[PDB]
Design a protein around this ligand. Structure first.
Ligand code: CLA
Ligand code: CLA
Ligand code: CLA
Ligand code: CLA
Ligand code: CLA
Ligand code: CLA
Ligand code: CLA
Ligand code: LHG
Ligand code: A1L1G
Ligand code: XAT
Ligand code: XAT
Lengths: 177, 185, 75, 171, 162
């Protein structure tokens, strides 16, 4: 009856055990929202998209700062400020990436709403397993848990890197030391 | 009552709460306002029966006591030295460290973190108002485990509330006096 | 934006225009504004009357404030 | 509570009992006016009405007439007084013709009872009908009312002229 | 000290000196008339005191903003007209007092419409009475302060003579 994460709180009604990373940590009861097209399905899809985006962004920042930029690309070690140097010399790359992300996000929203309507697609599912790393069950749950935990950690990390780069105008590991 | 004998009792200080002696001359434990509405302004839930002002006051008193105990520990620590093993914390007492650290962008971080914890535990308070069995000040935080043996739990309860009252008054004195036992006005 | 968080729509929060109107009675006005909510939610013509009157008054106020305090450069 | 109700418990009259039509202030104020004050003969009502009306009528004529004067002038006062008196004469002519064409009665509050009791099988509108039971609603009553209005108008206009002269001279 | 209107929460049926415990209905009606007249006059007096202090458009300015000083500056022929108007008003009130069903302070004749009074009507009458009492105390304080100090309300407050 009590949430596993917060023993002083009752179990959130909509979070039983199903989703990976579920420990009952919903103090504000946001999982019970059923308005403005927002429900547990939409919240989970948003959480998974945030997890994946944060993982990609943190990996990119760390890669560029440690191993350096790719040939022909600007340096500076400040990832929040090197973006304007890339846009100053290769605006077409940024524009094409933005257009591609826009199209993919329109497709993602359509897929989310459709799967919410005629329930056949789990939240965050895009059938993207080209290498077959999660075919069999009893490993899919473990992979989902790993992805969720890594994505939450990378969300926090990427938000921290964004704020550090905006404020200190220095590199992430530069702030570290 | 057991204190201020010429006043019988407020009305609600029956004894169901720990550390109860009956001291409430102004009868503050009888206000009909459910202070959970200071958090959730509307009834919101149809199951929100309501929270008595006495239980809200007990939660507030326990929280105040814990805050004051930690506060006097910190203020006494910075009077006798004991700076964090990092730069930018040199010596600037306690009457001036607050402002200089509010300037240096980390008191805001402390505000954010404390507010996050306060929001979670206030959601706990709101669930208590909704009608959860959780008692005031009970966050089920017993990691080391010195909370079993119900007699020990009750003794530690009364101990915590009495120590919190003492620490509230002691912090009031320390901040008003600008410390006399370990520093000067 | 602040004024937009006034009327109850889908949560237990905000005002009901029916309850506001029905509470505004008086000794000189009998039942007061009781039934006005039903009038303005079942008749497009009443809404058009109110909106058009206030809209024309707003247009005249705009006309006054325009020349009174010229809001455009070199106008 | 409701402060507007049908007049005299009749929901079909073209009237309402508002806090202005049937308020105690309205009752007393209209009952102290000469037109409705009890115990006044029609001549007395006319005299008081004429006095008040000439008194306030000389004002606009003297102040804004064709012969004004920012200082006090006897000619301006005489012009205003004559204009007020002639206006009172015109009003008295109107009263006289109105009373001539309106009523045919010499003693009211009785003829109505006589025709409600002893039958009124005549040309009507004199025996029967008869609107209003006041003494002002007779040929004799209205004639004395007009006479009083005219005399009181003259007297009040003269009094107001004297007061205006005194105020302009000694103040 | 009866079922009369005017009993509020802080002191219900406030007759500590027992003026009403022995008086008959006529004396109590007289007391209510006096209280209501004093309250209305005092509300007018307080509002006039303040407004005159910070606004005196009439008489082409002049008429010093301090009350109890403009009292001796009005042309004294405008005083006569105000006196006569108040007198005519109170003559009309006297005429009202003999109308059937008259109530002590009721010069609007609300007894004509208000039979079986509600709680809102009683509450509004009590509101008028309490505002009148507060204005009586306020105008007494205003006059006394202006007499002893010589400064008006917003002048004494502004300087800080408190
Ligand atoms: C420009 C084209 C474009 C379009 C049409 C969309 C469309 C969408 N995105 Mg999206 N996105 C884009 C570009 C785009 N994206 C880019 C370039 C990025 C960064 C790589 C993202 C990152 C992103 C994330 C991380 C999420 C979405 C989500 C969504 C969906 C919800 C839209 C909504 O209500 O937001 C309303 C628009 C807002 C700006 C509201 C957000 C306000 C928050 C509080 C800002 C917080 C900032 C703090 C620091 C929708 C399908 C969400 C989703 O799929 O949920 C199911 C989601 O979680 N997008
Ligand atoms: C959220 C994901 C994300 C985003 C928005 C970016 C954005 C960017 N990366 Mg990047 N990166 C990422 C993840 C991400 N990266 C990951 C996961 C890795 C590791 C595999 C890298 C490794 C990487 C390198 C090695 C370099 C960049 C560079 C860049 C910049 C120019 C390239 C470009 O337009 O990208 C779109 C590019 C393609 C689609 C191809 C741009 C600011 C370049 C740069 O200028 O860095 C300073 C560069 O040299 N990235
Ligand atoms: C994910 C974990 C994580 C980690 C390891 C760090 C680590 C660090 N952060 Mg940081 N941060 C994080 C999340 C994290 N942050 C998040 C989620 C935010 C909010 C978006 C921030 C916002 C933040 C700011 C605004 C600043 C740091 C700074 C720092 C550095 C100083 C640490 C300290 O105590 O100084 C005290 C340190 C390298 C500081 C820095 O760069 O020092 C120069 C600094 O100014 N962080
Ligand atoms: C009410 C509690 C409280 C508060 C507000 C402070 C505030 C402060 N202390 Mg401090 N301190 C306290 C208690 C407290 N102390 C106690 C009890 C001790 C002894 C253990 C110390 C020991 C101490 C040292 C040794 C030093 C300070 C210093 C400082 C200052 C720098 C920190 C800063 O800028 O904000 C940072 C942000 C915060 C302090 C907010 C606290 C947020 C915490 C970390 C969140 C987690 C709390 C924790 C998990 C509670 C567990 C309960 C529950 C979860 C079960 C600042 C004025 C330094 C200084 O220079 O002072 C002059 C310094 O060197 N303190
Ligand atoms: C900024 C983030 C934040 C948030 C959202 C909260 C949220 C909460 N705190 Mg809290 N708190 C915070 C930071 C925060 N705290 C910090 C940094 C401290 C240390 C100074 C405290 C110390 C504290 C105490 C000691 C108490 C709370 C209480 C509360 C709860 C009721 C608050 C209320 O009614 O309005 C608060 C609105 C106010 C205007 C505060 C009242 C100020 C009084 C009247 C004057 C006192 C002298 C100044 C609520 C869960 C109370 C609680 O749990 O009650 C059961 C309680 O007793 N908090
Ligand atoms: C007891 C009430 C009272 C008395 C005795 C005075 C006396 C005075 N006022 Mg005054 N005044 C009052 C109330 C009063 N005021 C109120 C309530 C207001 C707010 C509107 C004002 C606003 C006011 C201004 C703005 C000025 C004066 C001025 C003056 C002085 C010159 C007379 C004049 O022009 O009056 C003018 C009075 C008015 C314009 C408003 C009077 C409205 C009355 C009080 C309400 C209706 C009365 C009605 C006939 C009787 C009630 C009916 C029913 C309840 C029975 C004189 C000392 C003048 C002066 O020289 O100032 C120093 C001046 O310029 N007064
Ligand atoms: C019936 C209409 C009427 C008329 C014609 C007058 C005429 C006059 N009044 Mg007046 N007055 C009236 C009603 C009237 N009053 C009423 C109902 C009140 C309320 C009590 C007043 C209160 C009043 C005051 C307080 C003052 C006047 C003054 C004046 C005189 C100067 C007016 C002016 O502009 O100078 C031409 C003038 C003789 C003023 C006066 O006589 O001073 C010289 C003056 O101070 N009047
Ligand atoms: C302006 C007068 C005013 O609005 O006072 C307001 C007065 C008070 O009426 P009520 O107290 O009954 O109104 C309460 C509710 O109807 C709120 O509208 O309304 C009238 O009596 C209408 C009479 C108009 C008479 C025109 C003069
Ligand atoms: C209606 C809708 C879409 C939809 C739908 C459909 C289509 C109807 C289908 C479904 O049926 C429903 C629904 C709702 O899904 C809404 C669209 C979504 C919006 C409104 C898009 C918002 C995206 C904004 C982002 C993601 C911007 C991020 C900015 C960054 C800045 C980066 C910086 O580097 C910059 C530039 C400067 C540097 O110095 C530092 C920083 C600041 C870090 C980080 O990235
Ligand atoms: C949109 C796009 C790029 C957009 C870039 C933009 C907007 C950038 C604009 C800017 O930089 C400028 C200009 C100047 C700056 O100052 C301003 C900005 C704004 C910064 C590229 C698309 C690029 C699109 C590409 C490359 C598409 C390739 C498609 C292929 C190969 C299709 C193959 C198939 O069609 C067949 C053959 C058979 C079918 O049956 C099956 C399939 C497989 C679908
Ligand atoms: C008055 C008070 C407590 C009074 C208690 C009383 C009377 C108790 C009386 C009783 O117990 C007895 C005696 C006996 C019992 O039988 C009866 C009662 C009646 C129960 C506490 C004040 C408490 C007052 C407090 C705590 C004030 C704290 C102020 C602080 C901390 C300021 C912090 C700063 O941040 C600023 C604002 C600015 C920065 O630049 C500088 C610093 C200094 C850092």
């Amino acid at each position: 009856e009590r949430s596993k994460s917060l023993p002083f709180l009752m179990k959130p009604k909509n979070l039983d055990g199903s989703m990976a990373g579920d420990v009952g940590f919903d103090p504000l009861g946001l999982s019970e929202i059923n308005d403005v097209g927002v429900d547990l399905y939409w919240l989970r899809e948003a959480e998974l998209k945030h997890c994946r985006l944060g993982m990609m962004a943190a990996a990119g920042i760390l890669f560029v700062e440690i191993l350096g930029p790719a040939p022909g690309f600007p340096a500076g070690k400040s990832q929040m400020d090197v973006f304007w140097k890339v846009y100053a010399e290769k605006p077409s790359l940024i524009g094409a990436s933005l257009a591609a992300i826009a199209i993919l996000e329109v497709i993602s929203g359509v897929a989310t709403t459709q799967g919410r309507q005629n329930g056949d697609r789990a939240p965050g599912d895009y059938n993207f397993d080209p290498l077959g790393f999660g075919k069999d069950p009893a490993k899919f749950k473990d992979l989902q848990l790993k992805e969720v935990k890594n994505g939450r950690l990378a969300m926090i990390a990427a938000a921290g890197m964004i704020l550090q780069g905006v404020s200190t105008h220095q590199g992430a590991l530069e702030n570290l030391s | 009552s057991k204190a201020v004998p010429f006043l019988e009792a407020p009305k609600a200080l029956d004894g169901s709460l720990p550390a109860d002696v009956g001291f409430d001359p102004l009868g503050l434990s009888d206000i009909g306002f459910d202070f959970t509405y200071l958090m959730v302004p509307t009834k919101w839930d149809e199951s929100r029966t309501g929270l008595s002002a006495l239980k809200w006051f007990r939660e507030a008193e326990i929280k105040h006591g814990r805050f004051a105990m930690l506060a006097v520990l910190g203020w006494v620590a910075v009077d006798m030295g004991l700076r964090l093993p990092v730069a930018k914390y040199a010596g600037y007492n306690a009457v001036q460290a607050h402002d200089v650290f509010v300037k240096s962008g980390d008191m805001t971080v402390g505000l954010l973190a404390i507010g996050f914890l306060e929001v979670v535990m206030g959601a706990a308070i709101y669930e208590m108002s909704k009608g959860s069995d959780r008692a005031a000040g009970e966050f089920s935080f017993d990691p080391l485990g010195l909370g079993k043996d119900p007699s020990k739990y009750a003794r530690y309860q009364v101990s915590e509330i009495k120590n919190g009252r003492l620490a509230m008054l002691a912090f009031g004195g320390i901040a008003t006096q600008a410390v006399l036992t370990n520093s000067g006005f | 934006i602040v004024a937009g968080h006034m009327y109850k729509t889908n949560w237990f929060l905000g005002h009901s225009i029916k309850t506001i109107l029905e509470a505004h009675k008086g000794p000189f006005t009998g039942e007061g504004h009781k039934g006005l909510y039903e009038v303005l939610t079942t008749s497009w013509h009443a809404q058009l009357a109110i909106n058009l009157a206030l809209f024309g008054s707003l247009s005249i106020i705009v006309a006054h404030h325009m020349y009174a305090m010229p809001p455009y450069p070199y106008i | 509570v409701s402060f507007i109700k049908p007049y005299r418990q009749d929901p079909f009259v073209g009237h309402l009992a508002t806090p202005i039509t049937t308020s105690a202030f309205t009752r007393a104020y209209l009952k102290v006016l000469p037109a409705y004050r009890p115990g006044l003969t029609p001549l007395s009502r006319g005299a008081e009405i004429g006095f008040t009306h000439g008194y306030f009528l000389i004002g606009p004529f003297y102040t804004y007439g064709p012969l004004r004067s920012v200082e006090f002038s006897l000619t301006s006062l005489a012009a205003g007084l004559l204009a007020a008196i002639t206006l009172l004469l015109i009003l008295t002519v109107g009263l006289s013709i109105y009373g001539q064409v309106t009523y045919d009665v010499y003693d009211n509050a009785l003829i109505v009872k006589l025709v409600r009791q002893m039958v009124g099988s005549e040309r009507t509108q004199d025996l029967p009908q008869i609107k209003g039971t006041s003494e002002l609603d007779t040929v004799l009553g209205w004639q004395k009312f007009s006479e009083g209005f005219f005399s009181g108008g003259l007297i009040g206009s003269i009094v107001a002229a004297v007061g205006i002269a005194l105020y302009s001279t000694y103040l | 000290l009866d079922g009369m209107i005017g009993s509020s929460a802080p002191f219900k049926n406030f007759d500590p000196l027992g003026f009403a415990a022995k008086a008959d209905q006529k004396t109590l009606n007289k007391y209510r008339e006096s209280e209501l007249k004093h309250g209305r006059v005092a509300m007018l007096a307080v509002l006039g005191w303040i407004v005159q202090e910070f606004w005196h458009p009439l008489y082409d300015g002049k008429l010093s903003s301090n009350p109890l000083k403009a009292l001796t500056e009005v042309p004294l022929i405008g005083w006569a007209q105000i006196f006569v108007a108040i007198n005519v008003i109170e003559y009309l009130q006297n005429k009202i007092k003999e109308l059937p069903g008259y109530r002590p302070g009721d010069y609007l004749g609300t007894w004509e419409w208000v039979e079986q009074s509600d709680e809102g009507w009683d509450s509004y009458q009590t509101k008028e009475l309490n505002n009148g009492r507060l204005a009586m105390v306020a105008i007494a304080g205003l006059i006394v302060q202006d007499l002893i100090t010589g400064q008006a309300a917003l002048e004494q407050i502004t300087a800080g003579n408190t």
